[PDB]
Amino acid sequence: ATQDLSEYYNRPYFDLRNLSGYREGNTVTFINHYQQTDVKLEGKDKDKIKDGNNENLDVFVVREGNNSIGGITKTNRTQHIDTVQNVNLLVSKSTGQHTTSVTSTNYSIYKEEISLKELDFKLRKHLIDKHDLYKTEPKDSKIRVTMKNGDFYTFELNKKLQTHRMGDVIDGRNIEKIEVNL
Numbered sequence: 001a002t003q004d005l006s007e008y009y010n011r012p013y014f015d016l017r018n019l020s021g022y023r024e025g026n027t028v029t030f031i032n033h034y035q036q037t038d039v040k041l042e043g044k045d046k047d048k049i050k051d052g053n054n055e056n057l058d059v060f061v062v063r064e065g066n067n068s069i070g071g072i073t074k075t076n077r078t079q080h081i082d083t084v085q086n087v088n089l090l091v092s093k094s095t096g097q098h099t100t101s102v103t104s105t106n107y108s109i110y111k112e113e114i115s116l117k118e119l120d121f122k123l124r125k126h127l128i129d130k131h132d133l134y135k136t137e138p139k140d141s142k143i144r145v146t147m148k149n150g151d152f153y154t155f156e157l158n159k160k161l162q163t164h165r166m167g168d169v170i171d172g173r174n175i176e177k178i179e180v181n182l
């Protein structure tokens with residue numbers, strides 16, 4: 001399962017921007033000058049995308065198992081050459097009963113609207129790359145994303161993000177900080 005988790009979060013992802021998605025049923029189809037991708041609506045995403053053509057979407061694609069789940073957002077209304085938000089990321093690791101660390105960095109946000117799919121996947125890749133995630137059993141460790149209004153979103157690192165959450169989106173301007181406890 002840990003193996004499975006690392007295989008999943010090590011997969012490539014594709015960050016598509018400002019294109020059309022065509023909803024037929026519970027599937028949104030995207031076409032690139034490179035790939036056709038079919039994206040499943042499994043959650044509250046089902047309630048916002050219109051049947052037929054939807055313009056000016058972005059989508060965060062991870063091939064499952066060219067099928068991906070969720071990760072669809074409104075594209076940015078304006079070009080933001082500067083970032084949308086700077087977010088303190090705070091990782092805490094206990095390399096034993098004797099030693100604890102905190103890494104404290106800046107996570108830039110470039111999207112007005114971002115999916116949980118994107119946060120979950122990117123943070124986990126980060127954590128794999130720089131903090132040995134999934135070299136050990138994850139147990140109880142969680143990412144937590146906290147907003148300015150105190151609302152929060154939890155990602156449990158012992159399982160994949162729940163498919164019904166992949167299409168949930170938040171306002172990237174209102175993310176306050178991100179905290180992880182390995």
Ligand SMILES: CC(=O)N[C@H]1[C@H]([C@H](O)[C@H](O)CO)O[C@@](O[C@@H]2[C@@H](O)[C@H](n3cc(CO)nn3)O[C@H](CO)[C@@H]2O)(C(=O)O)C[C@@H]1O
Binds near residue numbers: 152154164168
């Ligand atoms: C609503 C809000 O502002 N935050 C709220 C979040 C948030 O609604 C969801 O993350 C959106 O996807 O949910 C919290 O709880 C989740 C559970 O919602 C989620 N869940 C439950 C089930 C089955 O009943 N399937 N998924 O499970 C996770 C942990 O894996 C969380 O508990 C959250 O993310 O923290 C509560 C939070 O206040």
